[PDB]
Amino acid sequence: ACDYTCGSNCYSSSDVSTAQAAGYKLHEDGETVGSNSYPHKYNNYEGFDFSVSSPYYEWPILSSGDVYSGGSPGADRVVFNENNQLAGVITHTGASGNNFVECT
């Protein structure tokens, strides 16, 4: 069973903490990867009710199981805060345009 289901992509807790740890490290060191400069601030335009406080940062999580290193980011993202607390896992899949919906 999936801990997080983003469209047709299946993720376990370990997939999420692994992706999150990589994004937080880059955030700490003030470095980015890719053309969209990840990790970057997640403004929460959609207004999700995250249990942890802002600011939020997004980092792509890949269905391949690999840690994002620069190519296409896919549609899924892990959202973490300043204290490296997981806010949630989101996706562009099933959302119009460049909007997001939470992964179930």
Ligand X SMILES: Nc1nc2c(ncn2[C@@H]2O[C@H](CO)[C@@H](O)[C@H]2OP(=O)(O)O)c(=O)[nH]1
Q: Which residues of this protein are in contact with Ca ion, per CB under 5 A? A: 15
Q: Which is nearer to Ca ion, 44 or 91 (CB)?
A: 91
Whole-angstrom CA distances from 58 to 1, 9, 11, 76 are 24, 18, 16, 10
Nearer to ligand X, 11 or 100 (CB): 100
Say whether 31 is catalytic. Answer: no
Which residues, 28 to 87, sit near ligand X by CB under 6 A? 36, 42-46, 58
Compute the distance between CA of residue 57 and CA of residue 60 in angstroms, rounded to an integer.
Answer: 10
Active site annotation includes 27: no
